Design a binder for these strands. Sequence first.
DNA 1: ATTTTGACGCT
DNA 2: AGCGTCAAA
Length: 429
Amino acid sequence: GPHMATGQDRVVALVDMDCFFVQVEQRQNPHLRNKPCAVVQYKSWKGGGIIAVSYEARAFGVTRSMWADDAKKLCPDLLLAQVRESRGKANLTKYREASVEVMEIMSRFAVIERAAIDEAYVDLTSAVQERLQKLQGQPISADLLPSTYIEGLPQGPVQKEGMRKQGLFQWLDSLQIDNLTSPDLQLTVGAVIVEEMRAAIERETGFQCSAGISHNKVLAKLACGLNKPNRQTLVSHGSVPQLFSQMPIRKIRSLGGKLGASVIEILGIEYMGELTQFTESQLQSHFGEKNGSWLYAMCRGIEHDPVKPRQLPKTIGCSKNFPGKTALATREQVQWWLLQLAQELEERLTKDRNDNDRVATQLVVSIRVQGDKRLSSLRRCCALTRYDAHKMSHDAFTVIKNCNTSGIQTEWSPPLTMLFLCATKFSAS
DNA sequence: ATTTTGACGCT
DNA sequence: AGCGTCAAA
Ligand SMILES: [Ca+2]
Ligand SMILES: [Mg+2]
Ligand SMILES: [Mg+2]
């Protein structure tokens, strides 16, 4: 009752760019705008692998991971943009730079946590308090929320936009605007701010995005996906029981893999809401102390993970796969590709040092051997003392050379299906 | 023969 | 330290 926390103490948003790499390419090439199109890496093998897909193309069934040749069977007029290739490998610089554009705009509004190349969490609690003081009891107009959905509404006693407006009207007609401590009002002001933030992103970059607004990161992330693209969704604390009552467990962030499968298998449930019937101790007994407490609160819509103040990635990495017959089988091959990776890494590190006043101090080398299901077969670290590609490639070879079983120095066995260099452990400079 | 990333947890 | 999990385009 009066002491039961309800996880309504924060306003958190998650902003996620729509079909991000596709929008980057469509901004650059107006011929691709408003078309079924996809972004592909490599072209020789089955037309290249698709990594991003416009919503027009998704209507034909085109998805990520599809070979372009196969996507063309579903969508013969599909347009394609290719990821840049440099030093023999795909190079994602254009998308990293577009990401910086968006992150820098979002940072003007509030502290953000960079969650991926195209998404960030936003802690809006303080901004909401400020805006509520500015508003001075003034009601919030639907015109301030032109792309907002209120999850769960409309309810009670045939076009999409019509439903959106009906739900928003019910919500705003039911708000108590004089209570500055009302969580629902705080979320609503949050959504007003997010409309402003999304408008700024689109104005200043050309890119559209979706967003979720709720009381914590997990619900904000879930909310964001409910009405893509180019829309935002408010998930209130009160919407949680109905929302979770038919929500597959795997849809909640962190439960899409083995742990989620085990929750389903061990407990014999399917939906997030069903978790409420277990005690905290029961959940801890199956999934561990940390996961158990997290599940117990999360299934009630409560999560405390903070929006971390971090706009920049903590690692800078470069990797290449060598699938099937292309696996690296000679020492020379391994050294040449380590050099290519190290040269890209050097370029990115030097730019990072100039832009962000920091230097990486550890180099992580990872390889995969043909026949291993795991992404990485072996990982070794060494000191990163100079931004020099020849030194980094030599040091990586030094730390992995003993993995070569082959009695012949010139041959590498078992062949390598992957090389990965990652700069970590940044210090101020 | 998706590939190329990035964060964080465990021991 | 080195390995595993989960998530992005
Ligand atoms: Ca996205
Ligand atoms: Mg994303
Ligand atoms: Mg996606």
